[PDB]
């Protein structure tokens, strides 16, 4: 009996999910281990980038034995083209990593000192792109009908927050209408 939530995912569970996405790293180190699902790696070379899963990068970052790379889409100069492209298409939600909220929480807790110009900038940027996008969702949510919605490109977290609401009142709405014919 899962109790909470249960129909929607838990906010934590979507991080539990996203940490399964691989991203590049800069190992300080120069057994085996096969583990199960990793496939990697031959002993990591210091000052050499390589591709590994996230939860291990985070794990090895707590010990500061590795320096995570910043994603090419996580930058303020990069985000600028994205909010510029977002203000100008009030309908569509543009192009999203789909994890961007949760990577934006996770990579800022520890890895923060690795980013170039992380301070007081990107958080200001993504807290914004997580603003106009949210209100655009609430103003795109007036057009609700059964059964269709284009939620286009939308974050996993954004999906998860509003899920019970939409997929509940769709189940009051479509419920009268299917049944009245």
């Amino acid at each position: 009996l899962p109790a909470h939530l249960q129909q929607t995912f838990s906010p934590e569970e979507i991080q539990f999910i996203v940490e399964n996405e691989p991203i590049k790293i800069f190992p300080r180190i120069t057994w085996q281990l096969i583990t199960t699902d990793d496939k990697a790696l031959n002993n990591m070379v210091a000052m050499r980038s390589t591709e590994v899963v996230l939860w291990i990068a985070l794990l090895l970052k707590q010990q500061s034995k590795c320096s995570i790379v910043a994603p090419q889409w996580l930058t303020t100069k990069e985000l600028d083209r994205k909010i510029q492209y977002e203000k100008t298409h009030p309908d569509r939600f543009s192009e999203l990593p789909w994890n961007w909220l949760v990577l934006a929480r996770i990579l800022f807790n520890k890895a923060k000192d690795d980013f170039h110009d992380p301070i007081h900038e990107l958080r200001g940027k993504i807290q914004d792109l997580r603003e106009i996008r949210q209100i655009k969702v609430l103003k795109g949510l007036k057009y609700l009908n059964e059964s269709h919605l284009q939620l286009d490109n939308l974050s996993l977290l954004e999906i998860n927050e509003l899920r019970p609401f939409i997929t509940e009142i769709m189940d009051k709405l479509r419920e009268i209408h299917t049944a009245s014919l």
Binding site: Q62, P118, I119
Partner: protein
């Protein structure tokens, strides 16, 4: 007696295992230095992710309950601030188990002199004596290699005469005052820099450690500023602000003041409760209280503006805060106020003076929280320890302020009652030394804690002597509420007015042990510190008479 890095690699090799680990680091006890030390220690362990137990010990007698009860798999032990005085080899016993002994108890202490049985005869230590007193210290060196293992009648008489010859000079040693050489924290940082960690909050832990004790002397600390300031120079958040910026945003040098709570309290209340200024200006006196206002008349600072909280005072007064004091304070003899201090700014929250933070933690330790009652109380202090431990963390500031709203109140208590004493002139000059007892007072609940009486005792020994000719004489205090006449009595040390020639080596430690060894009348060394003991009102008076004579100083 070892390299810090190498003692570290030892505590590494005996540590990590299946199951992990096991080590219990003992944080002890009520001294803020302990926190300062063991927090950067614990963070260092978390770095290599080495499992640990951490115990809040209060009583020295209490340690026996722990070490004798729960130990199973623990091959490497660590202890803090205990054992420098009384040896645990006899106290715990040990009983050697399995050379290359399985368990290594590290003992970190700032207290001197070390116990004789400790450093020589390696069993449980692995001593931390390094590097402060190395020394020699040839007096302890000849104490053993001679003693151990030690016509024929003249050679026997010669031998015995030599034995007593060493025993006399040896008796000079280990009978002596307990005085901290250097803050244990500093050394943990010396151990830490060899491993290569420069971490900022770590360094702040060092600053906290050093500034834990400036309330009481320095003594070497006056020369510790190089060893800190250089480190503050070994790093920097940004070459120039770049206001603020919201992150790093770190500690910096500012003209800080022994003045009390300048930043988190109203200015006037900040002079009026400050400890150094209580003294020179005679603030317990109504006639002297005015002299403060004359200070403000000299500064041109409104009385109404002095009453207002420091966050909100006008900007002009802030920019002139470092000048006006130079223009004026010099005239009142208050010229020693301005230190070069350390202040860490969290930015949009505020800033915090190195010292004031320590006032917050101390504040936390006593408040904001027949043997069953004392155990339960000491227990309440044990819980309260963690309430104080948490405030060190950066991520929770919300409770740190709960400390400060207390730190103010305590003074408002302490000062008040402190004045309640000087009105009755309760000081007994006696002959050999100064002595006092509080027979009655408001809210003795605050005075239960050793450290509360350390600070009241401190403002009082500071008040009585400016100096104030003549003869700085150590002070004695006593208080009672409940627990059936426990009458806690703490030893104290004299305060020189910033011109300090000698350490002076508190002698109450010895004078108390002489009485425990005489009639031992309800005398209890149960508190971890040699200066502070317990007594009963039945036996306190004969104890006071036996305290008066024979005077060891």
């Amino acid at each position: 007696i070892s390299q810090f890095s190498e003692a570290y690699n030892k505590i590494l090799r005996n540590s990590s295992s299946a199951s992990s680990c096991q080590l219990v680091i003992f944080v002890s006890c009520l001294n803020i230095d302990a926190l300062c030390a063991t927090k950067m220690l614990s963070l260092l362990f978390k770095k290599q992710l080495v499992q640990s137990q951490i115990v809040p010990i209060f009583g020295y007698s209490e340690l026996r309950r722990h070490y004798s009860q729960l130990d199973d798999n623990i091959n490497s032990l660590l202890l803090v601030g205990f054992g420098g005085v009384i040896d645990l080899e006899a106290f715990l016993e040990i009983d050697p188990q399995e050379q290359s002994f399985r368990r290594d108890i590290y003992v970190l202490d700032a207290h001197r002199p070390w116990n004789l049985d400790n450093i020589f005869g390696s069993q449980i230590i692995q001593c931390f004596d390094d590097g402060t007193v190395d020394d020699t210290l040839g007096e302890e060196k000849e104490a053993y290699y001679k003693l151990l293992e030690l016509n024929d009648l003249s050679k026997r008489k010669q031998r015995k005469k030599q034995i007593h010859e060493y025993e006399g000079v040896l008796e000079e040693y280990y009978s002596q005052g307990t005085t901290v050489v250097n803050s244990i924290s500093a050394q943990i940082y010396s151990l830490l820099s060899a491993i290569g960690e420069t971490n900022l909050s770590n360094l702040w832990l060092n600053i906290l450690g050093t500034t834990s004790l400036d309330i009481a002397y320095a003594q070497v600390y006056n020369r510790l500023y190089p060893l800190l300031q250089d480190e503050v120079k070994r790093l920097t958040p940004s070459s120039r602000n770049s206001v603020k910026t919201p992150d790093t945003l770190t500690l910096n040098i500012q003209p800080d003041y022994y003045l009390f709570l300048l930043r988190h309290s109203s200015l006037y209340d900040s002079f009026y409760y400050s400890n150094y200024v209580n003294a020179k200006l005679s603030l317990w006196n109504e006639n002297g209280k005015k002299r403060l206002h004359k200070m403000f008349a000299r500064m041109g600072i409104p009385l109404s503006t002095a009453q207002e909280t420091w966050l909100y005072m006008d900007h002009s007064i802030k920019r002139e805060l470092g000048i006006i004091f130079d223009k004026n304070l010099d005239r009142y003899g208050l010229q020693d106020i301005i230190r070069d201090g350390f202040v860490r700014t969290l930015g949009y929250r505020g800033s915090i003076s190195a010292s004031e933070f320590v006032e917050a933690l101390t504040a936390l330790l006593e408040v904001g929280n027949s043997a069953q009652k004392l155990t339960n109380l000491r227990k309440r202090w044990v819980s309260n320890f963690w309430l104080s431990w948490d405030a060190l963390d950066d991520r929770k500031v919300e409770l740190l302020n709960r400390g400060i709203q207390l730190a103010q109140d305590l003074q408002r208590a302490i000062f008040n009652t402190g004045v309640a004493i000087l009105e009755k002139k309760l000081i007994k000059h006696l002959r050999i030394y100064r002595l006092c007892v509080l027979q009655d007072g408001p809210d003795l609940d605050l005075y239960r804690n050793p450290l509360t009486l350390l600070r009241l005792g401190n403002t009082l020994i500071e008040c009585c002597a400016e100096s104030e000719d003549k003869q700085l004489l150590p002070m004695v205090l006593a208080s009672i509420d409940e627990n059936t006449d426990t009458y806690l009595v703490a030893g104290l040390t004299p305060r020189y007015p910033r011109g300090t020639k000698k350490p002076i080596l508190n002698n109450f430690s010895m004078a108390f042990q002489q009485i425990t060894a005489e009639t031992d009348a309800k005398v209890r060394i149960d508190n971890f510190e040699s200066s502070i003991i317990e007594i009963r009102r039945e036996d306190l008076s004969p104890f006071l008479e036996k305290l008066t004579l024979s005077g060891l100083l």
